[PDB]
Paper text:
Ae. aegypti OBP22 (AeOBP22) is a member of the OBP family of proteins that has been directly implicated in regulating these feeding behaviors. AeOBP22 is unusual in that it is expressed in multiple chemosensory tissues, including in the antenna, the proboscis of the females, the thoracic spiracles, in the male reproductive glands where it is transferred to the females during mating, and in the salivary glands. The monomeric forms of AeOBP22 are similar to other classical OBPs which consist of six α-helices stabilized by three disulfide bridges surrounding a hydrophobic pocket. Our results provide evidence that fatty acids are likely natural ligands for AeOBP22 and that the binding of long-chain fatty acids (C15-C20) is enhanced by a conformational change in the C-terminal tail that is critical to generate a high affinity binding site.
Other compounds can produce the same magnitude of NMR chemical shift changes, notably geraniol, citronellol and benzaldehyde. However, this only occurred at high ligand concentrations (typically> 1 mM) and binding is weak as exemplified by the concentration dependence of the chemical shift changes. Initial crystals formed in the P3121 space group, and the structure was solved using single wavelength anomalous dispersion (SAD) of a tantalum bromide (Ta6Br12) soaked crystal refined at 2.6 Å resolution. A native data set collected on the same crystal was refined at a resolution of 1.9 Å to an R/RFree of 18.3/20.1%. In this crystal form the protein forms a domain swapped dimer, with residues 116–122 of one molecule forming an anti-parallel β-sheet with residues 37–41 in a symmetry related molecule. For AeOBP22 the predicted molecular weights from multiple measurements of the R2/R1 ratios in both apo and fatty acid bound states were in the range 14.1–15.2 KDa, in agreement with the expected molecular weight of 14.3 KDa, indicating that the protein exists as monomers in the absence of other binding partners. We saw no evidence of any significant dimerization over long periods even at the high concentrations used for NMR chemical shift assignments (600–700 μM). Therefore, we conclude that the domain swapped dimers are an artifact of the crystallization process, and further discussions below are confined to the structures of the monomeric forms.
Numbering used by the authors: 2 to 123
Amino acid sequence: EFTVSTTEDLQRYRTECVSSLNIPADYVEKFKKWEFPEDDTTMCYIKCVFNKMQLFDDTEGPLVDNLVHQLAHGRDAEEVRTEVLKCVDKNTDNNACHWAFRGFKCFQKNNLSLIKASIKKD
């Protein structure tokens, strides 16, 4: 089942991906600041994190229902879906790392932020 990711999920996934991909220390510092070079190391890191957040599958590609759940904060879901779908394409160069990262870049361009604050009516 799909659950939305928080900052703490992201921190755990970063740690796991850094370990499993043997990411160099200097990349880790950038990643902690949410700064992402457009190189293979970084693109495969983004795929790894999106995999773990169930936002991207290496065969099916971007996972739209899950992305909408992650992005919408329970509001304007059909509008969010419209925006997400603009960012969905096929694996045109047969590199799942590039595929995932292309999605991410399109999210950034369209102001679709996967990790946002939430105000709770207490």
